Amino acid sequence: MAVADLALIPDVDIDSDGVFKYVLIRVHSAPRSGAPAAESKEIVRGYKWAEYHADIYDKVSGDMQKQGCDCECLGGGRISHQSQDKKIHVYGYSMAYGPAQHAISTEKIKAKYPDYEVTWANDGY
């Protein structure tokens, strides 16, 4: 046995090399289905293999629930960093789950990669 804690869960983990979908997932203190805490946390996941936002939500919340944690996607979007300005960018929406709070994503991705900067604008697709 082991028991996670919301601080131990990776805050951002992604596999990025172009344009690919991501989801914002709220996570709650339910490790072992018996952790005494009742906090909440958010994670940023997104990978080129998740051609649809449901793919990451099913995989990731499956892993969270295997640790014990209970979850809800706040929404989906996509991460890109193409442009002519290397600022990573977060935008778009899921159709099953709507637009995420891309605000949370940028502050987390900036903190993960302080050598770079990140922006969002919900105007895109």
Curated annotation (Swiss-Prot):
Alphabetical GO biological process terms: actin cytoskeleton organization; lamellipodium organization; negative regulation of T cell receptor signaling pathway; positive regulation of cell motility; positive regulation of insulin secretion involved in cellular response to glucose stimulus
Molecular function per GO: actin filament binding; calcium channel inhibitor activity; enzyme inhibitor activity; protein histidine phosphatase activity; transmembrane transporter binding
Keywords for this protein: Acetylation, Cytoplasm, Hydrolase, Protein phosphatase
Keyword Transport: no
Organism domain of life: Eukaryota
GO cellular component, one term: cytosol
SUPFAM superfamilies reported in the protein's UniProt record: PHP14-like
Stored InterPro entries: Janus, Janus_sf
Entry EC no(s): 3.9.1.3
Catalysed conversion reaction: N(pros)-phospho-L-histidyl-[protein] + H2O = L-histidyl-[protein] + phosphate; N(tele)-phospho-L-histidyl-[protein] + H2O = L-histidyl-[protein] + phosphate
Keyword field contains Cytoplasm: yes
Summary of the tissues where the protein is detected: Expressed abundantly in heart and skeletal muscle.
Residues carrying N-acetylalanine: A2
General function of this protein: Exhibits phosphohistidine phosphatase activity.
Record text on subunit structure and interactions: Monomer.
PANTHER family documented for this protein: 14 KDA PHOSPHOHISTIDINE PHOSPHATASE (PTHR12258:SF10), JANUS-A/JANUS-B (PTHR12258)
Entry's family note: Belongs to the janus family.
Protein name per Swiss-Prot or TrEMBL: 14 kDa phosphohistidine phosphatase
Organism, as annotated: Homo sapiens
Gene (UniProt): PHPT1
